[PDB]
Design a binder for this molecule. Sequence first.
Ligand SMILES: *C(=O)CCCC[C@@H]1SC[C@@H]2NC(=O)N[C@@H]21
Lengths: 261, 247, 673
Amino acid sequence: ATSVNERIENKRRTALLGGGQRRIDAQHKRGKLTARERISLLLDPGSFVESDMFVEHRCADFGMAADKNKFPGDSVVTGRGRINGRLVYVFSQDFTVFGGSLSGAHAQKICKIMDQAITVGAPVIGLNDSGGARIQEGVESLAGYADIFLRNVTASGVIPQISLIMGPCAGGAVYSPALTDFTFMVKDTSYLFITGPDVVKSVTNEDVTQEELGGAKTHTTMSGVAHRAFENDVDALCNLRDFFNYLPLSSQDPAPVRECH
Amino acid sequence: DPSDRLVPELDTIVPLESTKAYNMVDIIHSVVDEREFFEIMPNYAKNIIVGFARMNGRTVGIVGNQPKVASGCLDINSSVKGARFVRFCDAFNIPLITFVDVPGFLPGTAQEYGGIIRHGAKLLYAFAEATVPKVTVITRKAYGGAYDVMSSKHLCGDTNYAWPTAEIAVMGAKGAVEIIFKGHENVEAAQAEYIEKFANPFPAAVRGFVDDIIQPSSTRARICCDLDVLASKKVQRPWRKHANIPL
Amino acid sequence: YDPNEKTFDKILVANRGEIACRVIRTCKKMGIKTVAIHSDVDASSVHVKMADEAVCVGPAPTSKSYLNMDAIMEAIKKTRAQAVHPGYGFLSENKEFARCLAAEDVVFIGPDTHAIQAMGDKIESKLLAKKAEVNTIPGFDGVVKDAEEAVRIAREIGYPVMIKASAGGGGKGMRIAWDDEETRDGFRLSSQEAASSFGDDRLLIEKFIDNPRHIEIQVLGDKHGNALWLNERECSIQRRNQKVVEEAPSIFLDAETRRAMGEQAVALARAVKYSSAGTVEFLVDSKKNFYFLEMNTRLQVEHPVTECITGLDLVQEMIRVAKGYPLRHKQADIRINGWAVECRVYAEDPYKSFGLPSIGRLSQYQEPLHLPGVRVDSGIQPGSDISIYYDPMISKLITYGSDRTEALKRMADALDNYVIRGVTHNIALLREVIINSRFVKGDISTKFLSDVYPDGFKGHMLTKSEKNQLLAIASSLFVAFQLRAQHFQENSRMPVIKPDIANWELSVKLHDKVHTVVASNNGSVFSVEVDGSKLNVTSTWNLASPLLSVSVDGTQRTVQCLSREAGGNMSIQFLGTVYKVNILTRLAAELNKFMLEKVTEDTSSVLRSPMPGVVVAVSVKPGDAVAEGQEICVIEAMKMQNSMTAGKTGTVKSVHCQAGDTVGEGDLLVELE
Ligand SMILES: *C(=O)CCCC[C@@H]1SC[C@@H]2NC(=O)N[C@@H]21
C-alpha cells in the first residue's frame, strides 16, 4: 500500500522525538539535554557525519515485536567529526528509550566505532548516560560488555580515550570508563556505583543514599576515581573542547605545538 | 605421572546446593602433577588463590576462586593480587589455568569508597592484556560482570570448559522474578519456570560461550591436550610505547 | 545354580553400606531387578548408583531416616516390590517392622517374628536353651546367707566361680576364686561390703570360665524343618566389645568338639522353628568345655569368611529359601577347604583409646584386586565421604589360603598394598596384631589386646635391622627426588651443566635420634652406609606412583611416601606404620645447630576435642575447678560415645561447648589455668 518513503519519514521523526514530546519536555525540565544536541555542541558546526543511523534491536522473546516498545537507534549515537580542525570519533549514550540499556546492537556499533578509530588513529570521546540493563535479553547482553572491554585494552597507549559520564551509570558497565585515561563528571547528574544502594542496604544493613554512594563529590574527593567535576553539562563540553585541544591525536604524532607570543 | 589419567574424585566434589561451599584447593591438588602446588601469599586475600604448579612437566600458573571465604566474591585485595600474578606470568611467558566460581563483586560502603572500580579494572586489564595460552574451567557459578572479568571467552580466551554443575546468570533469581513481572504479582509458577529454564549451562552452550560440557573425572586430560596444541600462540597487536594500567 | 528357577521379580534393599552393594550384586547375578533406598547424605553413594531406583527416605540422621516405617511402606507401595532385604542392624531385628510388613502382601526375607520374640529376651531365651538340652552357663542365682552353703554350691559347680549379686557385691564370690578358704573370706568380706554399699548380702552362684574364647557356629534353616551347620568361626580378638579380626576354622577345638557343638547348635535352631540364617555363640574355656551364650538372628558382617571355606554364598541361598524351596545339601556334604582370615578396616585413629572415630573425605582409594587370594567388600569409592551419622566402617578384606600361614602371609601382603588417603584408619593396628607371636602360635583370649598393650597402641616397634632398612629407604628416596630435579630441556642459549658428586653425606633424624648416612648412586642401585652398615637398594624409582616396591639387600618391601616437605620433613608408610623423618645435608645440619629453637607454649591447659563429633552433655561450667580423673563432657560420634578427663587440676576460664552444639576437628573447647 503505502510507499517506503512515508515509513522512513515516520521512523526518522520517531527517532528524533524519542518516545514522545512528553518525555522530551520532562528531560528538558529535569536538568539535562539529550545526546544529539550534545554531539552537535561538542564538535564544529556542520562537520558531523553519522554512521549506521538506522539500527534497531530485535528480540523474539518477551513479545516485544510490537511497535509500542520498538524504537530505532538502539539508544546510541556514534559518529566522527572535527573539533578545531582535528578528527574525533564521538560516542553518546541515549536515555530516551530503555534508559540507555546496552544490547547486542549497542555493543556492535560501539566496537565498530572504536576499531575504525584505532585503524585511522583518532581519539575516542565517550559521553555515558545509562541507568540499567535489559533483563529480558539476559546473559547475552553481558557478553557485549566483555567485547567492549577488549577494545579498550587494545587501545591503551595507542590513542587517547576520554570518558565524560553524565548519567547514573551502574552495574558492569562502570568499567569501560575506568579503563580509559581521563574521567570527568558533572555535579548532581552523574553517578557511578557497581551495585545499587538497595543491595547494600539489604546485605550490609546500614542507611545509605545514592548521593553519598556515587556522587561526583565522593568520587572526586575521597574515592579517587574521577579527575574533575563540573557544575553542569554545557560548561563540561566547553572544558572538554580545550582539554582535547591540549592532547595529541595518537602516540605516533609528537606533542602539539601552538603559536605563542 | 601419566598425562592421561582419570580423576574419579571430582564427580561429587561440588555440592548440588546453591549455597553449599567446598574446598576448592582440592581440585587444584588433584589435577596437577604429583599432587604438588606452591601457593603464593596464602594468608592474604584468601578470596582468590594463586600459585605455581606443573602439568605434564611444564610450569603453569594457577589462579582460582575460593568459595569458602566471603562466598568467593572478589574485592580490591584479590584483584590486585591476581592482577600482579597474571602480569608476571605473561611477562615471563607461562601458561595460565583459571578456575572460575564467582557470584559477583562484594557489595558495601567500604568497598565503594575504597575504589573497587579501579582494582576490578586492574584485574580485568591483567586478564585482557594476557597473550600466553590460558585454559579456563567454570566449576559451578558465574554471576554478573564478574564472569566477564575473570577470563571470559570474548577476552581472547582459548578454550573454555564447563562442568555439568556450571550455571551462568546475570542477577539473583529472587529479584529477577519480582522485577520481570511489574504488572502484577506471580508466585510458584514463575519461580519454577525460571529455575527450570535459566538454571542450566544450555543457554550458554547453545550460544557458544563455552566449547562444550565435560565430565569432571576427565578434566585433566583435556587440559593437557590444550597445553600440547596451543603452544604456538603468537598474536599481533598495534604498536605502542607502553601500556597504561589503571594503577 | 540354574537361573531358570522361578523367584522374586523385584527386591528392595533397605540397608546402607557394603552389605547393600553385596546384596545388590548377588541379586543382579541371579537375574532379579533391584531397588535401593537412600538417605539425605547418601544420594551419591555407590549402592544407589548400582541399583535401578533411588527412593529417598528422608533427612540425614538415622533416627528418622533409616528407622522410620512409614517411609518404607511408601517406598514399597510406589515400587510394588514383592520382597525386601533388611541386611543387618538398623531394623532387621525389629518386631514392629516384621509384623507391619507381614500385614501387607509381601514377604520379609529372614526369620519369623516368633524367633525374634523368643531370642530377643534373656530369661525366656535361657528357659528355651534349657528346654533344648544345650549346655548353658550354670549357676544358682538364689539367696545364700551362709558361707558353708555357698562353698557347697561352689564345690558342686567347681571352685572357679562367677558368684555375683543382683545389685552387686564388689566381686562377691568371683574374686580370688581358686581355693575354698579364701572363698569363705570373700563371702564374709563381700557380705560386709554389700551391707555397706549395695545391700544384697546373699550370693548368686555362677560358674567361672578361664581365658574365655568365644566361637560362633553358623546355622541355616528352611521352612520344612531341615537345618544345617556351616562349620565354625573364631572371633576372640575384640576391643570395646566389638570384633575386629576373624578366622573361619578355629585351631583350639578338634573335630569331635566341633561336631558336638554342631549338633547342639542345630538342635537349638530346630527347637525354635528357625528359618533363614543365624548364629549361636559359645564361650569355650581353656579345657574345651563350652557354654552357650547368645544367638544372633541376622546375616552378620563376618559371614563371608565361612563362605570362603564352603563354596556356598548365603545371601542367594536365603533369598531362595524365603520363597519356599527346600535346601538341597546335607550335613555330610559340608567340608573345610583350606583357611580364611578376614579383617575389618575402619575409619578411626588407633593411637587414642583404640580407634577414636574420625571424619573427612576420601582423597584417593585403591584396593589390591590383582593380588592372589584377596577379596574385598567395600562400600565406598574414590571421592566418597564419611559422616557422623553412620558406622565408620570403610571396608573388609578376606584372604584364603591352603593353610593358616599362607592366609596370614596373603593378608599381610594385601594390607601392605591398600592405599587410602584422605582419612585416618587402623591398618597399623591390624598389621601389628596379625604378626604377634602369640597370635601366630594360637594362644589368644577375649582380653588379647587389653593386656599386651597396657599403655595403648604405640605403633609397631622396630628392631635395628629394619631401622637400618627404613633409614636406607628414606635416604635413597631423598637422593632420587633430588636427582630428578636436575633434568631439564635444552635451552640452546644458556647451557645447563649437571652437578657431579660421587656420594652424598646426609643427616637423618628419626624419632629423637640423629644418624649419619652416606648414599652413593650407580644408576638404579643405591649403596647406603648407615653407622657403619652397608646396604643395597634397587627399584624403578617411580616417584609419581602412590606406592613403591624396593629390594633392600634381598628382602622385598612395599613402601609409601607422603607429606614430602621441601624443608626435609617426610612421612613414610613402612610395614604399615607411618614414620616421620627429617633429612638434611651435613652443612645444613651444622647451620641448623645454630638457629634458636622456636619455643612453643603448649603444656596442657587446653582441652580441645580429641576428634570431632557432637557434644551432648557438659558436666562443668566456666569459672569452676575440677580435679584429675573427672570427665569434662560426652561426645556422640557415629553411634559411638566417649568421656574424657583432665590430667591436671585447675579453674576453667572458658567453656566453648554446650548442649546441642557442633564441635569441629581439634576445635578449642575448654580453656583453663
Ligand atoms: C549403622 O550403620 C548400623 C550399625 C551396623 C553395625 C552392625 S550392626 C550391630 C553390630 N555391632 C557392630 O559393631 N557391627 C554390627
